[PDB]
Design an enzyme around this catalytic site. Sequence first.
Site, short mmCIF file in Angstrom:
data_model
loop_
_atom_site.label_atom_id
_atom_site.label_comp_id
_atom_site.label_asym_id
_atom_site.label_seq_id
_atom_site.Cartn_x
_atom_site.Cartn_y
_atom_site.Cartn_z
CB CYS A 22 11.10 0.14 -3.86
SG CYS A 22 12.57 1.17 -3.52
CB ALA A 74 11.45 4.66 -1.21
NE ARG A 83 10.39 11.57 4.13
CZ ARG A 83 10.76 11.06 5.31
NH1 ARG A 83 12.03 10.95 5.66
NH2 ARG A 83 9.79 10.62 6.13
CG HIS A 91 7.25 2.70 6.54
ND1 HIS A 91 5.91 2.95 6.33
CD2 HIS A 91 7.98 3.60 5.82
CE1 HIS A 91 5.83 4.01 5.48
NE2 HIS A 91 7.05 4.40 5.19
S1 CFM Z 1 4.64 9.41 1.07
FE1 CFM Z 1 3.35 9.79 5.13
S2 CFM Z 1 3.29 7.59 5.59
FE2 CFM Z 1 5.41 8.10 5.02
S3 CFM Z 1 7.89 10.38 2.50
FE3 CFM Z 1 4.05 10.72 2.78
S4 CFM Z 1 1.96 10.62 3.60
FE4 CFM Z 1 6.10 9.07 2.74
S5 CFM Z 1 3.73 10.91 7.07
FE5 CFM Z 1 5.70 10.53 6.12
S6 CFM Z 1 7.08 12.28 5.71
FE6 CFM Z 1 6.38 11.43 3.77
S7 CFM Z 1 5.06 12.72 2.54
FE7 CFM Z 1 4.28 8.73 7.36
S8 CFM Z 1 6.45 8.58 6.94
S9 CFM Z 1 6.48 7.03 3.44
MO1 CFM Z 1 6.14 11.18 1.13
S1 CLF Z 2 13.38 -0.94 -6.57
FE1 CLF Z 2 14.28 0.50 -5.00
S2 CLF Z 2 15.14 2.20 -6.27
FE2 CLF Z 2 14.93 0.39 -7.64
S3 CLF Z 2 17.19 -0.66 -7.86
FE3 CLF Z 2 15.62 -1.57 -6.26
S4 CLF Z 2 16.14 -0.68 -4.24
FE4 CLF Z 2 16.78 0.67 -5.92
FE5 CLF Z 2 18.42 1.35 -8.25
S5 CLF Z 2 20.60 1.18 -9.28
FE6 CLF Z 2 19.04 1.97 -10.81
S6 CLF Z 2 17.40 2.83 -9.44
FE7 CLF Z 2 16.92 0.67 -9.79
S7 CLF Z 2 18.11 0.09 -11.65
FE8 CLF Z 2 18.83 -0.57 -9.57
#
Ligand code: CFM
Ligand code: CLF
Lengths: 478, 478, 519, 519
Positions: free
Chosen positions: A61, A64, A95, A194
């Site tokens: 999401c 993330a 990560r 992003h």
């Molecule tokens: S899945 Fe990179 S666009 Fe983004 S965490 Fe992985 S293939 Fe990400 S290279 Fe990067 S460090 Fe990444 S590996 Fe671009 S940052 S959202 Mo999961």
């Molecule tokens: S799509 Fe992303 S990871 Fe999901 S909630 Fe939303 S920002 Fe977060 Fe969060 S506390 Fe648990 S893991 Fe969710 S049900 Fe909410």
Amino acid sequence: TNATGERNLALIQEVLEVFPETARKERRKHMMVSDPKMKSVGKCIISNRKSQPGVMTVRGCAYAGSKGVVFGPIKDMAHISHGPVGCGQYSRAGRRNYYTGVSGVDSFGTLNFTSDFQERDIVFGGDKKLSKLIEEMELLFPLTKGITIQSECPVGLIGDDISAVANASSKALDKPVIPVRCEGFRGVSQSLGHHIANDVVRDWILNNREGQPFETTPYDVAIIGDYNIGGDAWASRILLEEMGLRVVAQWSGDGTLVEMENTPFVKLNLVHCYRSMNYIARHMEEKHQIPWMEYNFFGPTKIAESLRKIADQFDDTIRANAEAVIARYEGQMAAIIAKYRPRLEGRKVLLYMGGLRPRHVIGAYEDLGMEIIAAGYEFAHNDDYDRTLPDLKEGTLLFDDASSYELEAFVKALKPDLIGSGIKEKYIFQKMGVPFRQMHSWDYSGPYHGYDGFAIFARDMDMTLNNPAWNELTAPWL
Amino acid sequence: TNATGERNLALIQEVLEVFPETARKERRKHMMVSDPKMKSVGKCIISNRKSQPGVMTVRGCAYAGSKGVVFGPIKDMAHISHGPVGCGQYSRAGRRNYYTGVSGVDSFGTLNFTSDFQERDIVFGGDKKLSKLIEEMELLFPLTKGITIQSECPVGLIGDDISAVANASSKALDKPVIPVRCEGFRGVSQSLGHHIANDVVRDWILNNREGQPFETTPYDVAIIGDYNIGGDAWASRILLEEMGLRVVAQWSGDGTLVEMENTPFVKLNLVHCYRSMNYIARHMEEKHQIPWMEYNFFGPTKIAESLRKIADQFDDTIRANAEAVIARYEGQMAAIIAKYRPRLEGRKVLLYMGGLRPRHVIGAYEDLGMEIIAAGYEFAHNDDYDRTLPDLKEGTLLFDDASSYELEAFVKALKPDLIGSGIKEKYIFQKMGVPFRQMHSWDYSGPYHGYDGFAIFARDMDMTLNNPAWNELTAPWL
Amino acid sequence: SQTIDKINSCYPLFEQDEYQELFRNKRQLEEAHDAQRVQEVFAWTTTAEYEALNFRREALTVDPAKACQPLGAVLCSLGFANTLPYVHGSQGCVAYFRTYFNRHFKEPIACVSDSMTEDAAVFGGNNNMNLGLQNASALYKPEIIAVSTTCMAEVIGDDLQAFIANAKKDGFVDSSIAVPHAHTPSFIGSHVTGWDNMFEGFAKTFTADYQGQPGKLPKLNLVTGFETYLGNFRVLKRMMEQMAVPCSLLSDPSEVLDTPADGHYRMYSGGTTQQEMKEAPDAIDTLLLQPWQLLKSKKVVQEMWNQPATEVAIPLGLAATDELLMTVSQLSGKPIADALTLERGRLVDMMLDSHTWLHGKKFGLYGDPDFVMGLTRFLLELGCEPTVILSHNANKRWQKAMNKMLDASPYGRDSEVFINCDLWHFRSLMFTRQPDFMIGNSYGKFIQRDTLAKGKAFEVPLIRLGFPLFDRHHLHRQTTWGYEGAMNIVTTLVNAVLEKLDSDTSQLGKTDYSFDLVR
Amino acid sequence: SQTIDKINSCYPLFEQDEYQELFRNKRQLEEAHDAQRVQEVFAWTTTAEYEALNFRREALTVDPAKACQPLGAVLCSLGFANTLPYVHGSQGCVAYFRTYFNRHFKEPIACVSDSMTEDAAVFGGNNNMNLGLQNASALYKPEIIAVSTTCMAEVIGDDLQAFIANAKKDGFVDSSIAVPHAHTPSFIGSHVTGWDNMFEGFAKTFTADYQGQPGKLPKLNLVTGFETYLGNFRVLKRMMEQMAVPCSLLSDPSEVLDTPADGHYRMYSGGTTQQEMKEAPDAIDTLLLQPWQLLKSKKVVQEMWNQPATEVAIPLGLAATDELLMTVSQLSGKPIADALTLERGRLVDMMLDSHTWLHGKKFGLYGDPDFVMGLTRFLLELGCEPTVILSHNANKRWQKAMNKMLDASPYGRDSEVFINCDLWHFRSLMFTRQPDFMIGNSYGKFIQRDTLAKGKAFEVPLIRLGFPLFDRHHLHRQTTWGYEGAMNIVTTLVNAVLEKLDSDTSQLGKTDYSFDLVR
Ligand code: CFM
Ligand code: CLF
Ligand code: CFM
Ligand SMILES: [Cl-]
Ligand SMILES: [Cl-]
Ligand SMILES: [Mg+2]
Ligand SMILES: [Mg+2]
Ligand SMILES: [Mg+2]
């Protein structure tokens, strides 16, 4: 297309017969077979659409993408996961965006700061709790350089106004306090996180030292879009400094708020991850007249090409320095090819990762004699698919936002010798008897960028492809 | 005798009923009930006799008494277990005779040096092998101050002459090389190994510095017969030095060849283990006119008695120092007794150990209000039983060289609250539901000598007697 | 640089001279606080002064020791046969639940989302539910689609029951598929709350209209609650087979979390069947083995099924296992098996053999409320002192019961219990209370590191018992319940003591006077 | 000094200032070598020059990695029902055998001596044998008295067989008691030879006059040889029960080495019965699971019982367990149980899950010949490099087989095999060849300590697998054979790697860029 392209078009057909007719028609637009005479994907594929409900997409999401990817690595700031407890806990130190510092004191990346929303916060709103949290943060973590607020799903839904809180708290603390509306319901994947994060950096960080003196050199650059997975950005920075450049900033692996504020003073932005940070690179070109270029530090072919092109933006001294750096590591590169290419060449790979690596690592596999028979992305956009086409052999399967069903079916039919993908894919494919390397976390190894990273990458593909245990999945009496 | 005495005499008769007649009559002379008006055992008990074949005696052999007990502790010498591999391996670092040093370099107590007899050594003799062994030892272990040769069963049986080897090697090395004919079949227990070892010390070590300059003080003493189990001799040495004495030598816990060679220059020998080292104390009295005295550093009542008697051999300054040391630790003692006596008072203890501790620890148990209801030794002599009589309550069972069968039967009938014995006894009595403390190795704790040791002793008796697991031997549904 | 014969990964590559120099040069561009100021602040974070400020927090949480409700619902759901966990809401959540369990179990985790986005934020998530159930059914062919929710769905108030009825009536999901649901708001309680809520939804779906009769089947049901040691599901079945008392675990994910690597991927394996859940009301009784979190499950048992819900303590340790088997014996009328009494005596033998190293040792411990109470109990039974006891997700009733248990014991006199406190609180407590060891999950590694940085004398080593366990492999296969699990705990504790004592006495010429061969 | 609120044992008591002063004062009376000289010699003992001189030894043995014959006869004898081990000779031996096993198993060990002294040295020990059998019978009431010898008895030439025949003739031992015997000279072979010799004595006593018929009983006998993991006896019986193939272990001390602490001492418990041993010739076959030491046991099976003695490798690891089950299946005609194929696939899953931490790791290892061959084979199968392989008691024929195996593996290219070498030889090899880890018994703690004193970079951590294990508790309960044992081995190896990596990366602000939460 060739006989591979035909087998792959028939495979696409056979795999998608499982989907309800609507989803089937929709999903057929997310896969294609490559043609080396094609410069752009055009209508051949679509991407950056909503995921099909219920199909087990690999995607994450927007939180993330914002907290997990762009802001979480910045070591001198405290990042608040603002909402209920889950999001911050699941993404706590998952990560491997490496950094140096003293945890909890001057660097904060492995701590999970959260406002731990309870029902009371949903019912009355969380802005007062957020303001009090920030006061307690400052008392207990005085050496933060700045604070970010990473919104989780509930925050915008209950109508909270974290920008009002951030403005008030920034004045109260006299430090940058940066609000991010990266609720996971926004967008379709990590990708909008992003973009959201780049717009926030644009407005809340990048102008903070505008007009101030800053001692420059003619060779100042910034690494844009390297999150230092397993020390990838350090293994990249060393080559640029060996070539006589000064890396003023690294965004955001081992990165700092300070470096980011000093980025508008550089001479050239070097974009590794195009997907996640092209937005801010384009912004810096338009506002600050700083040129940018995409590069690739995976494997010797790409590294030499990148070092030469980067050095070509400066002058003859840096051009000569690029040749000197390439010559300095040529014996290391020859030894790595001589030991590992014979152990890997001819073997076939399937890649599935987020938004860059599925194309970016292809050169390094090809340097080791391996062939990519299929490549896909979780959340890439069509300009990433366009950029993938030059590095595919004719008839390769190219696809987008695959379900677990579709990945499993592609694997079963294509029978790759090795798969590179993520943690949710790892243990399924290993049970299917296919050597698997995590190509997000580097399977707890790395770095893979740079000359020192190519050694580790070669070592790791050999270790896993040729491990003796892959000959033992079938009991000998079966 | 009294009621307790009559019950013990009846228990004696009942226990011995299982023995075949020959053994039954012989075994009867190894047990008695104590009389507080008796100063000598006379004809009442016999000891230091062969053991009965087949009965599962607790005893070891003369190699255990010589190598394992007397010589093994001396840190600056290499001790060779000479014969086949078993003896040296089972006795490698079993006994916690503590020392400080750099293992394998200047101190060798945890290494197991052996001549690993093979069939060719039994057929052709081991002296040539032993001489070569010692050359190799000198090459690889140059910092030894001297070397001992501890004979195992075969050596004397095959007619080897290790004394000739020791004399030749000592000349070649220019270091003492000490031959010991401590073959395990000699004598009846560990005891003859002590006596053998003392006689060897007398002739091969003690005269090495005769007529040589040595700077003395009026208050020079040697600790004779303290093998520093868990640091016992350090916890004793500290008190003697606090009282103004100089401890020139410690035999042999943390001991050295050099200290032993300087022992004929002291003013007073302080014998703690009477059994193992009374021989050399008597010899030094005769030959060097050095007085000796027995003392006991278990618990505050005996420590105060010993400090006062030791100081009474000197002058008024050491007498006053004895009072000042006792006063300095009075608070510590009173706090230990006030914490632990209430947890232990009135509990009954059975003790079964080698040659000293069965009588020596009684005062410490009495200092925590515990009562000894039975005491026996593996290998003590009648002079040891004489020395036990003053510290037993009338009617206590006093016994010698008990079989496993006898010890189990005694424990089932007497129902001690706590048993103190060795490692071969520990896991039997714990399954019988009786709290057990190892009173050779201190169950990996200690020290138990001295004021610092009394605190550990009390903690340990409380820890085990009152542990909550002893209320769980019977399932709750039974 | 790298040499071909010995390639170094990240650590220790970055220890090389060229990278130490690189870091010095980068540090000049960060406006780093001075090293003395950082040292000063670190030392300050280890003090009682800092601890008092830390314990004044009301709004900030740092390093929580809990997760959110849907994680628990997913784990519950995985324990039923041919079941696909489905979380109605936003997809980020499902990537994270899968990944979190992936890294603990080292196994695949099946779970889907219906990917509610901004469109679903405005109109409600009914279209996502319809299409999500149709697509999930088509691709994964589950018998049961076990629906829970993310916080977005809860805030917007989607009516799960009504959506699921509408899906079946409109033909999005076949009527033969069972679609139990539960509302699992992450802003209430924690992941253990989700598990109990999910279990209540399975019980409603499979038994609401059933005319049950306790004791019609001479069996006992067992309900574990949120548990992530495979050996605990397995030891319960093994002990019940030795007791000769028929049993179903209601939610048993131990086969789907341990499928073989034999060339096939099995999304579904084992689990509670529909027949076992539908006939659950006919058992003699249902034993709720983690009683503090199984709150709605106790209401199922007593109110819906009219069974006793015989109170049982978490079966961790010797006395609590004894009580479990005496309860099984009383309810069934069958005697305790001689093999179990023999196993019990072997545990007691281990306890007696190892007691001198454990007696009086001080431990800090944290985790879920049931686990922390159980392990605290067993530590008291071993003669250990659980001096610092924390459960972030526990409540005041639990804390009252804990202090009651502690006050009654000789070994609870220096014990402090903390609720609604996190691991940044626990970190201060490790500095100020300094137990010998701490028992926790992989997040405790940072606290161990922090205490070592004050000095070797201050280090509190971590013993890994709990969840998640991400930095060691295959600990999830272990057992912590029954006599078998108590054997594991005893061995783990004693050997942790002995490993630390060896390390402390391993300095040649200095502390190795006490580096004993035999312990 | 001591304070009432925190009493310190020896360590760390002697760290206190007053004891450090005591030691500095005592040192002045020892004529100690100066610290600089001691340092210089220690450093020299870590070098290649010292190693070459160390490997010139022909007479001195230092830190052996073997024990003597009668120890293994005692352990074999403990494996038969109602059997009292008896060692004819000198009593110091029996005190040491009992103690040695007491410290590994944390259990009581019954064994008697007949206490031959100087009188028996001149007259021979026939009087000791007569009285010894008579007194042991009366006190301990064994059904079987299993007699072995000490070196005194061997050197003096005591005719064991004649002595026992005389004790029987003269009424010192009743006709209801069986008295199997073996000559067990400690100056030949090692403890593994004594076990095999004792087994041959049991075979003669219980089967020599029997007219057997292989396959009259549809069962397999299993012979373990010298083995000190209780789980290895247990796992074999559990797998055979799953195969549905009747089986007897011939020598199984796992019940008498694990009696419950319930208020009773039980000198005898379980064990191979006389019925099992006497009907052994009627089995289909006997499988000798440690083939290098079971030399006379193989002659028994083939020459006395006319059975195949089907060759089997020690069942350690995945492939050797698959080979044992295929052998059991082929000989019995019964298929491999689905539960065993499931367990095999879970072991393979574990191997694949953990392989990236084990691949390429370098190990030193030592132990008995059969164990070292089996563990080296499994390390090669994991893609590890067993670079230093030592077996003090192995012979030249074993070494040739080891080198054949290693030459045929890509992972054996840098492996060196040492026989008739000891742990002082192993210590030099840890300094000069520096493998990542060393697998050994508790005597390897001193080698870990020595390597750490050269520096943290040179430390070789010990992983405890073997015998004796004296400085950790309850590792003798574990399993190392079968799939179950291989899961223990894999888990043990990968978590040693990960514990070491965490320790290396646990320096706050320095190496903790790679102190990863997830591994
Ligand atoms: S899945 Fe990179 S666009 Fe983004 S965490 Fe992985 S293939 Fe990400 S290279 Fe990067 S460090 Fe990444 S590996 Fe671009 S940052 S959202 Mo999961
Ligand atoms: S799509 Fe992303 S990871 Fe999901 S909630 Fe939303 S920002 Fe977060 Fe969060 S506390 Fe648990 S893991 Fe969710 S049900 Fe909410
Ligand atoms: S059994 Fe001492 S006469 Fe000797 S090793 Fe123990 S009760 Fe010996 S005090 Fe001593 S340090 Fe001893 S504890 Fe005399 S030395 S042959 Mo086993
Ligand atoms: Cl609670
Ligand atoms: Cl061999
Ligand atoms: Mg820094
Ligand atoms: Mg797995
Ligand atoms: Mg035991």
